[PDB]
């Protein structure tokens, strides 16, 4: 079994700027012919992985040459140039050299941005939902408020991944209640809240 | 280049299934259709691969008691059955074309969402969410997954008993 390793399992880079995702094979891809049977692809979220980068560092039709690929034998690197928000997604190597062919873990690239706040919307119902839209870091809280009493229990949250466009991170909060009160406050990490009655 | 595969199946656990790929859009016995294995926020697994110009099969020793590779060269058509499933087996599978001799050329279907379990099938329950801009709308109730939505944000379905939920929004 030919096992490749992408020791990575993300990597986060400043837009414009340039990094590389390293991809080793426990047996070399060179074959007699002289070709090396490695191929990357990239998956966007939400999408189904697409070719990107074969043989040595031959790029797939479309692909930007801002992408760029290297490597010995076992070692391997893809490199992207000028990183664009529209890069997010995780990069898999692959062997196709011996049966059976096998994938190495993947590595997640994710993008450094300016600090963002979050705008934040409130819908009453039998469900109260809140979005914190467009915010970055990814790092953020929501607090539920019933009539000023901090609510907690009866809380599902979901969470976007990184932002195609510009890098921003988005979350979805539902307060599920009994189908007798009357402030639903919702309120981000002076703050940035809403509320209704 | 297309190879549509369904959105989903669920499958009863101990029982079997048959995925189906059509190709067209390009000279189907000319390239080998290998299927992949993604489980939920997992990585990529090669299942096995046959090419329909000769009829030869590759199959990875994991899954050589769990999938059988057919294709139907009439219909354009790939098959892949997976035996006996377990809740193991709930994944997204791929089928996936590669020309037999050019290296640069591979295309990915859409894959198709299996989901191993005794429960039963539940259509959503869609609602408003209008500004107390930015709209709303709240897909509560349903299995199993997937669901399509489109007009933005729509956020991972979520669990609750037995049942997803998920919301998206619109900004305007
Ligand atoms: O050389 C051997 O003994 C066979 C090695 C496997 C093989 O035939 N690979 C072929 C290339 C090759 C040819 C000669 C020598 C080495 C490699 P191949 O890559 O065309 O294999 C056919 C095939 O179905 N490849 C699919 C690879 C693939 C898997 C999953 C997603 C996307 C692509």
């Known amino acids: 079994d030919i096992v490749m390793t992408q020791a990575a399992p993300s990597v986060s880079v400043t837009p414009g700027e340039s990094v590389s995702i390293s991809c080793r094979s426990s047996k070399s891809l060179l074959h007699s012919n002289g070709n090396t049977y490695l191929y990357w692809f990239l998956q966007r979220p939400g999408q189904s992985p697409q070719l990107l980068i074969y043989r040595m560092s031959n790029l797939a039709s479309g692909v930007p040459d801002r992408f760029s690929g290297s490597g010995s034998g076992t070692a391997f690197t893809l490199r992207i140039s000028r990183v664009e928000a529209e890069d997010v997604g995780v990069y898999y190597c692959?062997?196709?050299?011996?049966?059976?062919?096998?994938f190495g873990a993947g590595t997640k690239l994710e993008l450094k941005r300016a600090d963002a706040a979050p705008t934040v919307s409130i819908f009453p119902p039998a469900s109260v939902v809140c979005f914190l839209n467009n915010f970055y870091p990814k790092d953020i809280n929501v607090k539920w408020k019933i009539d000023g009493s901090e609510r907690q229990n009866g809380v599902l949250n979901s969470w976007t991944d990184q932002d195609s466009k510009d890098s921003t991170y988005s979350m979805s909060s539902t307060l599920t209640l009994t189908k007798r009160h009357n402030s639903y406050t919702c309120e981000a990490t002076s703050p940035i809240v809403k509320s209704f009655n | 280049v297309q190879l549509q595969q369904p959105g989903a199946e669920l499958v009863k656990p101990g029982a079997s299934v048959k995925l189906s790929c059509k190709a067209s859009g390009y000279t189907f016995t000319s390239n080998w259709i290998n299927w992949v294995k993604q489980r939920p926020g997992q990585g990529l697994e090669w299942i096995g691969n046959?090419?329909?110009?000769?009829?030869?099969?590759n199959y990875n020793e994991k899954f050589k008691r769990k999938a059988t590779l057919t294709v139907d060269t009439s219909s354009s058509t790939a098959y892949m059955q997976l035996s006996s499933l377990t809740s193991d087996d709930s994944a997204v599978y791929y089928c996936?074309?590669?020309?037999?001799?050019?290296?640069?050329?591979?295309?990915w279907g859409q894959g198709t969402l299996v989901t191993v379990s005794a429960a039963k099938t539940t259509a959503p329950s869609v609602y408003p969410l209008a500004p107390v801009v930015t709209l709303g709308c709240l897909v509560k109730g349903y299995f199993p997954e997937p669901v399509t939505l489109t007009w933005v944000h729509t956020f991972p379905a979520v669990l609750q008993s037995d049942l997803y939920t998920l919301s998206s929004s619109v900004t305007v």
């Open positions: 996936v074309r590669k020309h037999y001799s050019y290296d640069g050329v591979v295309y």
């Open positions: 692959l062997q196709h050299l011996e049966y059976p062919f096998t």
């Open positions: 046959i090419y329909p110009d000769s009829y030869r099969t």
